[PDB]
Design a protein around this ligand. Structure first.
Ligand SMILES: CCCCCCCCCCCCCC(=O)SCCNC(=O)CCNC(=O)[C@H](O)C(C)(C)COP(=O)(O)OP(=O)(O)OC[C@H]1O[C@@H](n2cnc3c(N)ncnc32)[C@H](O)[C@@H]1OP(=O)(O)O
Ligand SMILES: O=C1CS[C@H](c2ccc3[nH]ncc3c2)N1Cc1ccccc1
Length: 411
């Protein structure tokens, strides 16, 4: 049983969601006025804190909590080390709601003990195309289309409870208070992802990694020298040769994205993302925020032909603490972010992403099999990793879809 999640408006079993055919709310309709105006009660030794995610010292406080207590791999070899600059970027997009950043601290010393963050997103999340088809066959098209319009919902991430406070049921409380604050803004859905299985994902995809620094990856035991490299003479030279990349990008026309590229990037991105069942909608302000280059944070390159932007890719940086190891403290990872190709095959565009990342000092490039990420796996030498990333809605009935029908990247 799930003492918490059984109380929530989410489907409860894989069996419930296999039956779902239309997109729509799960819960009773409610109004801002129904929602308690005061924070959810917590123990008197604690207090709720809304950090100011533009005060360097509050960012630093969140930074430390996540550095020491946020997501690790299943073998506790790595832990994400999101940077302060990354956290400010991810938590403060245009029109963000400071109240959706929710922390608990110890009343005494103000030691930060838990956090969860919501940000706004405009998401297309109506009935998927294949259900809309069945709907038509059956005369149920208006039902199928009722929730087609993009919705302003909340994106939740960075849920974290201090290692000392684990399994004390604090995470349900964080989630309830976040839910209250968001509802008080008259928002009734959320989208979130996790590596863990909860009730109940609408989509799940494997991770993929592309070695850029295989000697470092083997040394930290992220990668192995596969047993076929055994009956070879000097494995590490072969491994390095297998993953070697050009020193410079191959697409003439490639350069970093510029603020004046914003309208064209927006158009080619929206045209592309619009083909997926679930995906965000971005204004020019959101394209500038999420895609303009920002040092050590996000890296975005466009292909410009005939003074026109016809393709682009982006990746973002999240270092991980290497937990065991002598020689290394940090793993430097690039994650494929949004992209669009109109003039070249997708593998030729993403090869330049790998070349750039490698040339800028990244050890590995990671992604999940959403978008059309599967279309370049084999040719660019990506391998399936261990985790699955599961996608979830809160308060939204949604049929099970494949991850290749998902166009929302989660930071
Ligand atoms: C409309 C607006 C809606 C807004 C909110 C929408 C929903 C947002 C939902 C949150 C989206 C987060 C997206 C991300 O950020 S995913 C990343 C989550 N963070 C980490 O994994 C960091 C390392 N771990 C921790 O900090 C803690 O272990 C956490 C905080 C994960 C659990 O703390 P703890 O280990 O001390 O356990 P507990 O005794 O306090 O609580 C036990 C309950 O918590 C349920 N649990 C465990 N892991 C997760 C999980 N990742 N999402 C949702 N629920 C989770 C679990 O099934 C159980 O309930 P139930 O099985 O008894 O029923
Ligand atoms: O820092 C962390 C904590 S959990 C996440 C991670 C680690 C190993 C993985 N294998 N497959 C997915 C996956 C995710 N991760 C980032 C990462 C990505 C690639 C290699 C090492 C760490």
């Amino acid at each position: 049983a799930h003492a918490f999640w059984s109380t929530q408006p989410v489907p409860q079993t894989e069996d419930e969601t296999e039956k779902i055919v239309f997109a729509g709310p799960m819960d009773e309709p409610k109004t801002v006025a129904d929602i308690p105006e005061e924070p959810y009660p917590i123990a008197s030794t604690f207090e709720w804190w809304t950090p100011n995610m533009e005060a360097a010292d509050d960012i630093h406080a969140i930074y430390e909590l996540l550095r020491d207590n946020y997501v690790e791999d299943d073998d506790s070899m790595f832990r994400f080390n999101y940077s302060e600059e990354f956290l400010q970027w991810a938590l403060c997009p245009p029109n963000y709601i400071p109240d959706w950043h929710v922390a608990v601290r110890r009343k005494a010393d103000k030691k930060l003990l838990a956090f969860i963050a919501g940000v706004p997103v405009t998401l297309r999340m109506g009935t998927p195309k294949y259900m809309k088809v069945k709907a038509q066959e059956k005369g149920e098209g208006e039902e199928a289309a009722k929730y087609d319009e993009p919705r302003h919902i909340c994106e939740i991430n960075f849920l974290c409870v201090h290692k000392q406070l684990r399994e004390k049921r604090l995470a349900p409380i964080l989630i309830k208070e976040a839910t209250r604050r968001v509802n008080r803004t008259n928002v009734w859905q959320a989208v979130y992802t996790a590596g863990v299985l909860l009730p109940t994902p609408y989509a799940s995809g494997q991770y993929f990694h592309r070695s850029l620094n295989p000697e470092k990856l083997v040394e930290i035991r992220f990668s192995g020298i596969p047993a076929q490299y055994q009956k070879f003479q000097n494995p590490m030279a072969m491994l390095k040769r297998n993953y070697q990349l050009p020193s410079a990008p191959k697409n003439s026309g490639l350069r970093e994205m510029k603020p004046s590229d914003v309208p064209q990037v927006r158009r080619i991105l929206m045209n592309y993302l619009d083909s997926f069942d679930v995906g965000p909608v971005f204004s020019d302000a959101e394209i500038s925020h999420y895609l303009l280059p920002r040092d050590g944070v996000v890296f975005t390159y466009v292909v410009e032909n005939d003074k026109k932007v016809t393709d682009f890719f982006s990746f973002y940086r999240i270092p991980s603490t290497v937990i065991g190891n002598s020689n290394y403290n940090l793993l430097n990872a690039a994650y494929v972010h949004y992209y669009a190709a109109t003039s070249i095959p997708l593998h030729q565009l993403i090869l330049d992403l790998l070349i750039v990342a490698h040339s800028r000092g990244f050890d590995v490039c990671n992604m999940v099999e959403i978008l059309d990420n599967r279309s370049f796996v084999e040719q660019l030498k990506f391998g399936a990793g261990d985790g699955h990333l599961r996608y979830y809605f809160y308060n939204w009935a949604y049929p099970k879809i494949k991850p290749s029908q998902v166009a929302l990247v989660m930071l």
